[PDB]
Every structure is written in C-alpha cells, then in structure tokens.
Amino acid sequence: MDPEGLALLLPPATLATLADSWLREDCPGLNPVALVTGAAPSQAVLWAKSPGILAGRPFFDAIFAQVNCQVSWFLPEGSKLVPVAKVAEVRGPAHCLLLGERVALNMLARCSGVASAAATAVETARGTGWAGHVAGTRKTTPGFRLVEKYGLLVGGATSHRYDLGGLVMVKDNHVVAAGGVKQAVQGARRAANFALKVEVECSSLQEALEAAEAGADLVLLDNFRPEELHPTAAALKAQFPTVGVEASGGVTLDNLPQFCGPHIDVISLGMLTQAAPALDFSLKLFAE
Amino acid sequence: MDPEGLALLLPPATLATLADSWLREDCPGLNPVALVTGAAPSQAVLWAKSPGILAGRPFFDAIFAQVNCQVSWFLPEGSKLVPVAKVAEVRGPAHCLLLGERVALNMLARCSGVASAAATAVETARGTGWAGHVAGTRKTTPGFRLVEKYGLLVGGATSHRYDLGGLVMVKDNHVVAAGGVKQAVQGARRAANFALKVEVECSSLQEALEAAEAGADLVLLDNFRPEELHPTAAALKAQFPTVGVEASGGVTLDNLPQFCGPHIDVISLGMLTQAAPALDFSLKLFAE
Amino acid sequence: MDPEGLALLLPPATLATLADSWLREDCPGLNPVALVTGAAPSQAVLWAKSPGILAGRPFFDAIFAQVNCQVSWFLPEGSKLVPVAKVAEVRGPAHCLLLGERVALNMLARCSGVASAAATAVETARGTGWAGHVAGTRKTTPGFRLVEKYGLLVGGATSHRYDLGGLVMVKDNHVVAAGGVKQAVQGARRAANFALKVEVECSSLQEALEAAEAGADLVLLDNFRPEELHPTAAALKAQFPTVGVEASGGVTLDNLPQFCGPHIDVISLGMLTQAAPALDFSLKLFAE
Amino acid sequence: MDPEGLALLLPPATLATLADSWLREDCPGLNPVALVTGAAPSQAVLWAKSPGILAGRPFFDAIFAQVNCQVSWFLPEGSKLVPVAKVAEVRGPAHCLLLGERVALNMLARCSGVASAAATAVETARGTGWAGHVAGTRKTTPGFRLVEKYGLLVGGATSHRYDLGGLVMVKDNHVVAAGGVKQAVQGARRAANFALKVEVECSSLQEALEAAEAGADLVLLDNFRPEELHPTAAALKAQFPTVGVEASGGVTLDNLPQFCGPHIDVISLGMLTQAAPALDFSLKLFAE
Amino acid sequence: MDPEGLALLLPPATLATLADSWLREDCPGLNPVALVTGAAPSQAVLWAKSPGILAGRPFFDAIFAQVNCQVSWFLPEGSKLVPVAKVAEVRGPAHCLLLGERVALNMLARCSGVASAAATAVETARGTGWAGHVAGTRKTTPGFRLVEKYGLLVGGATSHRYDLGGLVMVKDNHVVAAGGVKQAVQGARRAANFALKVEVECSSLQEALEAAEAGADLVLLDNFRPEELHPTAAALKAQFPTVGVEASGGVTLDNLPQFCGPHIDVISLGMLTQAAPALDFSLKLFAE
Amino acid sequence: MDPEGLALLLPPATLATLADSWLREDCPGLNPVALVTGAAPSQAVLWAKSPGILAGRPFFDAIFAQVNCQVSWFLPEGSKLVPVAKVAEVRGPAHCLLLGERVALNMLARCSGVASAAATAVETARGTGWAGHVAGTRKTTPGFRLVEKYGLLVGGATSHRYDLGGLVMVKDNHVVAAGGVKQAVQGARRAANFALKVEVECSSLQEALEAAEAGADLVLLDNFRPEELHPTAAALKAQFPTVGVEASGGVTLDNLPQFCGPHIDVISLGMLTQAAPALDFSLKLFAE
Ligand SMILES: O=C(O)c1ccc[n+]([C@@H]2O[C@H](COP(=O)([O-])O)[C@@H](O)[C@H]2O)c1
Ligand SMILES: O=C(O)c1ccc[n+]([C@@H]2O[C@H](COP(=O)([O-])O)[C@@H](O)[C@H]2O)c1
Ligand SMILES: O=C(O)c1ccc[n+]([C@@H]2O[C@H](COP(=O)([O-])O)[C@@H](O)[C@H]2O)c1
Ligand SMILES: O=C(O)c1ccc[n+]([C@@H]2O[C@H](COP(=O)([O-])O)[C@@H](O)[C@H]2O)c1
Ligand SMILES: O=C(O)c1ccc[n+]([C@@H]2O[C@H](COP(=O)([O-])O)[C@@H](O)[C@H]2O)c1
Ligand SMILES: O=C(O)c1ccc[n+]([C@@H]2O[C@H](COP(=O)([O-])O)[C@@H](O)[C@H]2O)c1
C-alpha cells in the first residue's frame, strides 16, 4: 500500500548484488576519468527535472554504497515530483561520486517512469469510482524486472504475477497446445494444487464459462472491446459469483476509464512498462 | 555498418550468458504451466504488429537455444517492419517454446523499439542533407546495455562510447571537481594518453575554446539553443578546424533538423533509449 | 502430474547450471585419479539396491552431460524400485564416467529417497480413502530445493509453496510481530492482492475463525492433537465452507491415518525431507 | 579436535557467499510477507527440540548477517543438546529476522543431524576401547558438502577425503578400468607423487596384499563380514606393518562395535550423511 | 602520471570481487592448517627481497580485507624497492593472516615485476631524450589483466589498449581477411566512428601511407629493423603530419634506445608482461 | 604421467568455464573489429617461434570452442618445440577466429613457458643421475593456477600440492604462531588425520629431527646452502629412514645439480613459475 513501506520487500543482499552487476556493466575495468577529478570529498544534489512519482530509493542507495558514497533524502518514496525538485544529496570522494552517477540516474529515471505511469493510470481508474486493481504485466525489460515491478508498486499498481511460478497462467498458446480450455485448466489444476491460482485468458463467453466451470480462479477477458466486455463480465459473474475477472489488451491511459466496470476486478496494461518514458534527473556537484 | 553485418559484433558466449540470466530471472525454479501443454513438437510464428525496424535476432536466437528451440527468420536484421509481418518461425517442444516466449518477445520489443527510434532520427537528419552521425548516449537500462546499444546500431545511429573504459568523457561535474576546464583536460590527457579520445562538455563558446586549446579531440556543446549553437560551432571550428563538435540535450525527433548544421559532426539524443516505445510482437503456435 | 510428465517442469539450462556447480564442488581443480584409468570408451550399469521410487533422471542426465557422457534408461521416472533393479546404463570415456559417478549417485540417492518417503505417505493417506493432498514443507536442504521438491512431486506429494515468492504464508511469528491475527491477514491481503493466496498458521479454533473472517484462503491448524483437529476443522469449515484447511506438525508415516479426515484438505509432513533416508544406488563398469 | 576450534577452518568470505546463495534460493525476488510484520526491532530465541549435538554456528551467524541480524549464543559449538534448550537469541528488524529464519534452521537442523550421528557413532566406537578413527565419506548432499563435513568434524568424526584432489582413491570401478590392482596403483602412484596418499579398496586378501606391495598407503577392506575382516586385517598388517587399513560397507550405528578391531585404523559409515535425520529447531519471537 | 594517484582507477567492489576469486582458487573449502596456529591476534611484516618498483597496494589491501586483516604501508605506491625493505605490516588473527599470505604475495610479486620492467624500460627510453611513450600490449596473463595493466601504469608505462573495445586495432590477420589495407581501414572507420581511434599495423611504407590515407589515426610500424624504421617514420610523418606512429616487435630492454627516434610517438614491448620476472617478497610474523 | 595422458586430468566443464571468463575479460561487450573482416570461413596456422615444450592444448581448444572454432593439432602435448614448428590449424568464421586469437596465444605462451622451464629443470636433475622429483610451488599467478600447474606436469615436474586443501604444509610462520615445531606438528596431525600428509619447513637439523619425531611425513629443509643440506639430510634420514626430504629456496637452473643428492627426494623451485619466460607463438590466416 503506502509507498514508503514497500522498501521492506527488498532483501539488502539482493540490492547490493544487483548494484554490483550494473556498475560492472558500466565500468568493467579501469576508471580513467577518476584521474580528471581526484578523490576529494564532494557533495552533489539529485534534481528532478520531470514531473511524476519518485521511485527507486533502495536501489539508488545500494548503487552509491558500492562506491562508498552516502545519500540523504528530502523526498519520501512515492512522492510526487515537481521540477526542479531537490530530491536528495549524495556525498563521497569525487571520483566515486561520478562513477556511481550514471548508473544511479538510469535506474531511478526508469523506476520512476514506471511508477509515474502506474500512478497516472491508478488515479484515472479511481476517478470512475471503480474499486478494482490496476496491474502491470510480464512485459518487463529482461534483467531489470525487480526494479520495474517495484516501480509499479510505488505507483500504486499491483505487481500481478512476478514470475512463471507465482500463479498458473493459461494463455492463448497454452490452450491451443492443450487442445481446448477444459483440457488446459485440467493440467493447470494439477500444476497449481492448493498453493497457486489458475488464470485462463478467454476469447469468448463460452471459453470464460468453460474456464470457470473447469475450476479457474480468475478469468482474463483478453482484447474485448469494452462494449462487448462488461456484459460478458456480468454474464460470467452471474453464472460464477466467486471467479475473479481481469481485463487486458489494447488498454491505454486515455481509454482506461471505458474498461472500468462493476464486474471487472483487474485491469492490466502493458504500456506501464512498455511505453512509460524515463523521468529526467540530474546530479550536480556543489561547493561547501 | 550494413544492417546484417552488425550481428558479427556479438560473441556468441556473451549471448548464451545473457539469455541464460534472463530466463533465470523469469523462471528461477519449476515451470508449473509446462504440465498444461506437454512437450509435443510445435511451431510458432512471430508476428510484428508495429511498424519500424527489426533488431535483436542474435539475442532472440540465444534465448530459444537455451530452451532447446530453433528459429528460422523470414526477415533480415535491419528490415522495415510493416504490420502484420510474419517475421520468423520457432520450433521445439511445446513447453519449451512457451517458456522462451515472454523473454524473447520482451527483448525484441525493446531492441526493435530502440532501432525504430534511431532509424527515424537518422532519416530526419539525413533528409536535411546533413552529413553527421546521429548518436545515442549512456542512458541505457541497467543490465540491458548490450541490447540497447546493438539496437541503436541496427537503426543506423552510432553507439557512441560503450562505457567509461572508452573515450575519456569530461562532463560539467568533472570540470567543477577538477577546478576548471583546462585543468580537467590536463587530467583527461594523462588518462587517455595516445589511445583514447577526449571529449569535453562545454556550455559556452569560451569554455569550448579552452577545451580545444588544451588538446580536446571533441567538444560537446550542451543544452544550447540552436540559435547559439551554430555561431559557436562555427567560431570554435574556425579557430580549431580539426576538433569534433557534438550537440546534445533537448534534442527530439520533432526538433532535430534545427540542430543539423555544417559545423556539427555529432548529434546525440537521450530520447533514443529513454523515450523509445517498444514494438508489439506476438508469438503464436500453429498447425497443432 | 503423471510421473514421467514431471520432467517437463525443469528448464534444461537450470539443470546444466546445477550439475556444473555440483561437479565443481566435488572436483574444483585437477582430477588425479583420471591417470589411474585412462579414457577408453566404457559403459556402466546403475543398480538400485533399495526398494522405493525412482526420481532424479533429469538431474542425472545433466550431471553426465557435463562430463560428456550419455545415459540410456530402462526404468521410467516414478517407477517402483525392486532390488536389484538394473536401472540405466551410462557410456563415455572411463575417466569421465567415474568423475560423474559420485555426484550423480549422491543426487539420485536423495531425490529418490524423498520420492520414496512421499509415495509411502500418499499410499497410507489414500488407503484410508481420504481425498486430500499429502504435502511437503519448506524444510529442504539449502541449495538442493529443486531436487527435493521435484522428488516430492515424483512420489505423488504436492510441492506446496516453492518459496517466499508464492503464496503469502502467515506463521505464528508473523502474527506475533503483526500484533494479531486479523492485523496480519490485513497485511497479508495487501501483499497477496488478487494473484497470491493467503494461508494462516492457527493453533486454536478462535484464531482459525478470525483468519477466515479477514479473508484467508487457507487455514493451517498447527500442532493439534488429532482429537482437537477434526472438531475444529468441522467448526471452521461449517462457518466458512470455502476456506482450505491444512494440518501439520507431528505427522509421521505411522500416525498419518488419524490426521486423515473429511474437513482436512492438506496434510504436510516435515518428515518427507528431514527424515527421508536416501536410496542405495551403485554404478558399475562392465564388458571391459 | 575440540569442537569450538573447528570454526577456524572456515574462511569468512566463503560463509558469506554461501549464506547468500541459500537466501537467494529461498527468496529470489520480493519478500511479500515483509509487509505483514514491518521492520520493528525484534528478538527471537532458537529452541532445540531434538537431542543431539549442536553444529553449524558459523553458517548460522553468516545467514543472519546477510539480513542484518545478530546472534548471541548460549551453547558452544559441539554441545550436547537437550530439549527444550534455549540455544541462542537472534535480534534485528522483524521482517529481516523472519526472512533469515527458514534458511538458518534448515542449515542448522542438518548440520546438527550429521554431527549427532557422528558423535553417537564415535562414542559407541570408543566404548570398545578401539583407538581408531570413525570417518564420513563422499556420500554428501551435492552443493552442501561444506556444511556436512563440518558437521562430521563437530561430532568428532574425521572428514576423510573432502574432494577428488585430496588423496588418490582407487575404487572397484577404477581397478577394473585399469586392468587389475597393480596396474591401478601404478597410475595412482604417478598421480599422487609425494604430496597425496593412495588408498585402494580391495575385495580379497590377495588384492589387499597386491595393493600394499604396489605401494598403497592405505587399504580399504570393503564390504567384509567382520568375521572375515579382522583376520584379513591382521594378515595384511603382518606382511605390511605401516599400511593403513580402513573398513567400510554395510556399517551401522548398531553393528559398528563388531567392526572395531586392533588391525583396523579407520571405519567409515555412509549413514552418517545418508541416513542422519535432521534435528528439530524452532525460532520464536518474544517481547522485550 | 604520479604512481600514488593511479589507485583511483580501481573501483573498490572490483577489487573485492577479484580478491575473493583468488582466495577461493587457493582454498576452495576448508583451511586445515588454521588448526595449527589458532586465531590469536598477530602481526607480520612484508619484506621486499628483490630490487624494483612497488606496485599493487590496492589489490593487496583488498585480499587481506577479505580475511579480516589490516595493512599499514611504509612505502608509497611506485616507490623504488631496495632489499631488504620493510614494505608494510599486516595485522589480524594468525590463521587469517596466513591464509591471505600466499595469494597476496603472488599478486604483489607479479604486479611489481611488471611495474619494475616498465620503469626500467621507461627510464632507458628517457635517457635518449626521446619524448615518446613506452607502452605495454595485450600479451597479458588471462584473468589477470587488471593487475598487469595497473603494474604497467605504476611503472610509468601507458596501458595501450585495455581491451578489444578501446580502439579499433587493425592487425596483420585483419588486413588479410579484409583483402588489403584500404578495405580494412574502411570497415575500421565504420566501426570506430568518432568515439574510437583506428590503428593499423603496416609491413611496408606503402601500407603505412595507404593506412594514413584511408583515415588511420595511428600507424603501427611492426617488426622493422631500426635502420629501416626511422626513415619510414619520417617519410610517413612528412606526407602525414598528424598521424601517430607506433613501433613494436623484437623490442627489448637492451635494444630499446635504438628504437627511440623523433618520428616515433610510441614504442610497445611484449616483454613487459611476457618476460618480466616476479619480485621476491616474504611475510614473516613477529612478536609484540 | 606420460605427456598426452595429462590432458585427462581436466574436466571439460572446468575448461569451458575458464575459457569463457578469459574471453569475457578480453571483450566484455561489443567486438567492433569484427566489421573489419566479416565472417567468411577461414583457417589459420599456429606457429611456435620459440624452442621448448608444448602445453595448453585443452585450454586452447576450449577457448576456440567458445567462439565456435575448431582446432586440428599436428604436434602432441609434451612435444619438443623447434622453430618454426607448424603446430596446429584453426578453422572458423574470420571474425571469430580473430576474437579467439589473443587469449589463446596468451594462454599457450604461458603454459608452454612453464612446461619449458620445468622440462629443462628435470633434464638437469636427471642428467646428474639423481632419482628424485623436481617440483613446483604455490607461487602461481592468481586465477591462472590450473594452467600453470598443468604446464608444470607436462614438463615432467610434479605439481606438488595443488592448494591448502591437500597436504598440511607447516611453514616457519605456522611454527612461530604455534609457539614451536612439535606443537605445530601436533596441530598439523589433527588437521591431517589419516588422509593428508604433513610437511614441515625446517631451517636446521634439530628442527628437522623434532618434526620427524612428532610424526611429520615430510621435512622441508629451506634456504640451506648445499654444503649444510646433505649432511643434514643424511642425518635426519639416518634417524628416520621413512621421512621424505624436500629442498627448496635459492634453487635455479644453473645451480640445480648441487642440490641433487641421495638423501633428497624433492627439489622445488619458485623459478618454474616466477621466472619462466613465455614462448612466442603467432596465429596466421592463410589460403584467403
Ligand atoms: O503473463 C502475465 O504476466 C500477464 C498478466 C497480465 C496480462 N498479460 C498479458 O498481457 C497482455 C496485455 O498487453 P497490452 O500490452 O496489450 O496491455 C494480454 O494480452 C495478456 O495476454 C499477461
Ligand atoms: O557518457 C557518454 O558516453 C555520453 C555520450 C553521449 C551523451 N552523453 C550525455 O547526454 C547528455 C544529454 O542527453 P539527453 O538527450 O538525454 O538530454 C549530455 O549532457 C551528455 O553529457 C553521455
Ligand atoms: O513455508 C512453507 O511453504 C511451508 C509449507 C508447509 C508447511 N510449513 C511449516 O511446517 C511446519 C511443521 O512441519 P513438520 O512436519 O516438520 O513439523 C508448520 O508449522 C508449517 O508452518 C511451511
Ligand atoms: O570416496 C571416498 O570419499 C570414500 C571414503 C570412504 C568410504 N568410501 C566408500 O563408501 C562406501 C561406504 O558406504 P556405506 O554407505 O556402505 O557405509 C564404501 O563402499 C567405499 O567405497 C568412499
Ligand atoms: O593488440 C594490441 O593490444 C597491441 C598493442 C601494441 C602492440 N601489439 C602487438 O604486439 C606485438 C609486440 O610484441 P613483442 O612481444 O614482439 O614486443 C606487435 O607485433 C603488435 O602486433 C598489440
Ligand atoms: O604451499 C605449497 O604447496 C608449497 C609447495 C612447495 C614449496 N613452497 C614454498 O616455496 C618456498 C621457496 O621457493 P622458491 O623457489 O620460490 O624460493 C619454500 O619456503 C616453501 O615453503 C610452498
């Protein structure tokens, strides 16, 4: 829920190991430009130049700790950012500060870009009175899923499935390989047991009812026009009152209100991670 | 750098290693949904649903090699994508094909997203009859730099410096820490020696002259208005005809042509990687 | 989850990586004994000297692939092992076959040891005509969880939750820290959202009611005497017919049937992994 | 020797890297249940619920240090454990305490289970007046050999060979590949040189004498009945007074005294690692 | 430049991760000899027994920090070493001191051996009045390039190219695969762009002029006798005044003065890393 | 240890892993020079330009397998190299062949450099008609120990102890910390038990006697003058005829014969790895 508690989701060793791979990527050997500046103790401020939502403090602190620098934060995680906000101050030896700089901003810029999109979508969804959840997807940048999912949460969206072991997601392709919806859910059931849930994407109302009848827990009504979506949803809820319904496909920040209806429990958008632009931050040294 | 020749830049062990870590990220332990489909030999078509430029084949192939699947491509790297292009076919056991799917689509979506953004930028700069390079920056998604830099190249843009190990890049922060521009170039010169180039971020003509004076191979005029840009470039280049001039900051697709001019050799944009929307691809099983 | 189909749950790169690290553990540098035998092509039989259930083939195959050896299997995964079953044959250079031997036997001994324990448990619970799942726990040997969970499945038991990323498991410690059961479920609900299930460790009927009250999908009645177990389960399930009931703690093979009852859906035992003796296998060269 | 000094065998970086892989296994991404408890500073006690021998403190401290928690010990390494002993207290933020919990107990439970078996075997062996060593084997859980060998030592058993580079062990299979005992020892000799020892398992008295005559340092009399074992041993010692003799195969905690004779220097048991049940520990939060 | 500032080139995490792999190599499991000494706090002195130049402090401190030991330095990085110099004192628990010992000396011995050769070559080159740079090569020990390049720098030599991404080096083989010098430089140009430099090794004067004419930045005059080298150099400089010239091949500490001429900007020697003997250091415990 | 049989000591996964990390070191990201040549199938000859002994084929093959290239060898491992021997041919895509080149040459140069040094040492000691082993030490390049120890073996020297996990080596520092020689051996004996040998660094006859007295298998007489060496060895060996004697320190090629004597079993030299110049190899494309 509240953005500041979300940092408890991240084990410190995980953050350090991650900050380490990123820095290795950016400077795998020697850092020549360190000779340009030397190591005098220095101070920089992180400035937010785009509007949105601050997300990524834990990764950010971790990166800078890998180059022996410390960060002091003026804004809490999940704060609205308004240009040109003095977000934080970073201190350490000049060469170490500037080595951490690029990696830290790249991370923060994207973590916050996702969180901003998430929050814009969630706020819009709220506007309609809808009580449902706005969710992300598995359309994340390979290697960088931890950061992107955390961004989503900071923006107030639900992670949805983190990985291929969190809930048994039966998609289009799986149905076809299985030879029909009933057949797919049947193997999904054996795979899920009591621990995991089963979600099946459906193209029609028959499929959605066949799904729920087989023992699906959630129904993903995929790529419906909203005109055809909500009656199908009401219908499914009418024959199956407990079954969660999700709506996905061709959803955008602009068209999202249309997708918000009383029989829809979840709306997921790929654009939260696929088309969320990075926020602009800078880090500038200052004297004192 | 003809499109298909760019694949030769990537060692295949680098590709296997990257692919492995991405599939690990997506499925760290058991793959329950495998029970849904079983393992019958299957085939899927990869469809491009967005217009643009195809990039990422070599990563795409390694991803599917890691779960023992083969790929035949109908479009070469660099191709203009027109919806709904049938772009490749993938064959392998049904469960393995579908394990590979998400990561492979997620990768290609972004690599092609970046190539698309670059190619568009290049077409614009070249339609002005400007004969410089359109460049990318170091503003890449942490962990995903090889794919994004490779994407940039496929789109005809220049990778620029791959990392802090290449050309010695002197930024405002470096100059400030160093106590001045010449002083910084002086440190930069011992860093670079005879093997590496020196570029210097300058935000004024005088700063630019002092940089070229102390031996900088390149001068980066940063966050100028186009109006101050060319007179300054003409000035510096008049006094130093051998020094390269890069412009950057604020540059977008819509406004690129006004940065195109005779005394500009390089134009970089953050936008090629920070605001590049991914392409929509799908992977669909067929012929049961 | 038919026996042989369970192999499909394991990505082969995961298997190669695991096998590699185990052989590394056993032989970090030089393999001196290789000089003893030389490299002539050789063949060995794998013998099962203990009764039980065979599990571990996919790990077994990857181990021997890493030292370039091939395996043909005469018994399918899931098979009842009767001494002295000839279970497979392994071929490869003599030195490579014998490097692979120890790790491969050590692995299969344990994976089959766990499957054996589970299958026995299942046979007992099912001979009572109880229609629930026999489950394992998270009490697995560190580093060896994939093998032990895979072993459990081959024996017909349920993996339960693979890790802390799956269903949100609320234990006594969690409830205490959270200051109470509902309060904890409340935190659990925001953790799980719509994708993940919530299970709650309850050691009394009232605690169980408050858990099901605040929305828990499952209630784990822990360290009950069988005598208090069923009346409590009947109670909770009477008030909440949709909530799953798990029993655990104290459960062994000898005493399992008294935990089998109508209002118990899941019975877990620590014993399946903590007290499961490994099977005796040997690998013997033949036909010089 | 004395159990408390054995911790000096373990390099701190080795323990940390190990604790890190185990935690990554158990929670590879986000820790949802952290939201259930929050991060308030908390305290738990480690309770020993089974009898035996405490082993594993160094790994245990290392795990908890990876999640920023501290442990205070009331029992020294190698102490007899009597239910329900208050073994130690762990302190740290509640979510970090509970994240370390499962992994720490799994490790300790098994390290101590091995050490308990070891000590039971060693005590029994002592009972007969026998001055020999009781040893473990290479029948260890793959990936977890460091912990299991350390357990053995804490229980007072000797590690035997840690890996395939510690002494040149010529087994059944190796003899056969080599074409006889003399031939095998001959290559073993060249492989061992002065640095390593040569041990050859023998099936008869001829083999044992051929072994010793070839230059074996130790003879492993494998799978003899004790009636046939000790005369063979005396015989071998009589023709070869310096040659170490080991007895192995079908040895159990119950039958071990039979195997203790004056001409036997070592008795090794696979059951110390293959059939040693885990000790029961718990960790319970407490208020103060 | 000045040897003491060169340590700023090395990110601390890089040094730690490196010190960690080296120690793992040397003791992958248990450290038996720790029982011989125990853990009493101890002190040792590092003695320099060979003449030369001290190089490697940062790696050295990092190794000892991995085994919880501290080092105090009496000589600065880049100091001349004269037998039998008391270079530094190391303190920590005795077993941890002695575990760090071998790895630390091996590193330092070689880092310093390279630096000594480098300095001997650089001093000799200076003797002639020559203003050029003395460079190393890519003939480094695999895995240990960071240390060897740093040694070179401490000795006052320039790193030259660190890796295959620092400058586009067109060698003999590449020319042949490309089908001539012009063809090679043409692809090198496209590969380099503005960021990287292009160096082409040439066998004759024609090749060197063809190189410079194609747009090479540096010419490597490879394996010339000095009699034929300097006129070729003057010639090339005469038709191309900006183009850097490097001389390489069959250069030794003894013959190097012959290679120093006014038209040579760089002289590189493989013997700086291929034939530089290790310096002799020891570490001896002392009482106090 | 016949030359070609030594290849059997190396697990091929160890080789793949090593090769991978070396190519990573040399080319962490993009390989720009690949554009220079393209990918046409090509062939190169490996030439030996220095006299000596060939060692490193198995590493050489793995290096070229990692960039998909094949190798045919015309000379077996252990061969005497006479300039300019055509030693192998390598085939593969031109860009891949040249990526592999540097690392493969760098490796073989050193591995053959060490083998050359050892073989020479052995020939000298054996030409004196001395029947002991010439040994190496633990003074190996960090990270490169497998190659250097393998190199030593190919040259006919003995690897000695591979690491701190093998024989318990008691050095002067160990003895000092332990407060005395017997005391140290006493600790060493419990460390080694029955599986591992004990060697003790002694710099005087009396120290040597106390070592052999307390049960040391080997006595290392360190930094003796040859003149004190043999009378001491004769002495110790007269009192203990079963204890091995190693001499070391100061030993070079030129002075080796005076260390060769009847009561010396092992002679080690630092020189085999610390002062062993690498062999000059080249790799040349041919037949366009
Ligand atoms: O795979 C899961 O992680 C998952 C969770 C929620 C939605 N999806 C898929 O995401 C797709 C939504 O993509 P989009 O870009 O059209 O918003 C939709 O077609 C579903 O198949 C997938
Ligand atoms: O570090 C690099 O290699 C690098 C290469 C090209 C550009 N940049 C930085 O990119 C900055 C602005 O890019 P933009 O389009 O995101 O505003 C500019 O200030 C440069 O210092 C950085
Ligand atoms: O963490 C899990 O996924 C998990 C799954 C199933 C069971 N457990 C725990 O196992 C405990 C007892 O098991 P046992 O058989 O070893 O006494 C019980 O208190 C549960 O909290 C834990
Ligand atoms: O391989 C060594 O690590 C080793 C050391 C001591 C004993 N062994 C083997 O261990 C076997 C003993 O197993 P067990 O389960 O019958 O007690 C015996 O047959 C020997 O072959 C093996
Ligand atoms: O590849 C670069 O790293 C590089 C930089 C400077 C010199 N070289 C090569 O190094 C060779 C010099 O080797 P040497 O051992 O003869 O001094 C020469 O033939 C050049 O091909 C190579
Ligand atoms: O640690 C080892 O395995 C080891 C094996 C053989 C020799 N050494 C050490 O090498 C030292 C001298 O070798 P050198 O030739 O470099 O002077 C001597 O004091 C031994 O302690 C060390």
Numbering used by the authors:
A (entry chain A), B (entry chain B), C (entry chain B), D (entry chain A), E (entry chain A), F (entry chain B): 1 to 288
What wording appears in the published article?
In Homo sapiens, Rattus norvegicus, and Sus scrofa, QAPRTases were reported to exist as hexamers. Although several QAPRTase structures have been determined as a result of extensive crystallographic studies, structural information regarding the reaction mechanism of QAPRTase in higher eukaryotes, including mammals, is limited due to the lack of a structure in complex with a reactant or product. Here, we report the 2.1 Å resolution crystal structure of Sus scrofa QAPRTase (Ss-QAPRTase) in complex with NAMN. Our results represent the first crystal structure of a mammalian hexameric QAPRTase with its reaction product and may provide structural information useful for understanding the mode of binding of NAMN with eukaryotic QAPRTases and for designing drugs specifically targeting the QAPRTases of pathogenic bacteria rather than those of mammals.
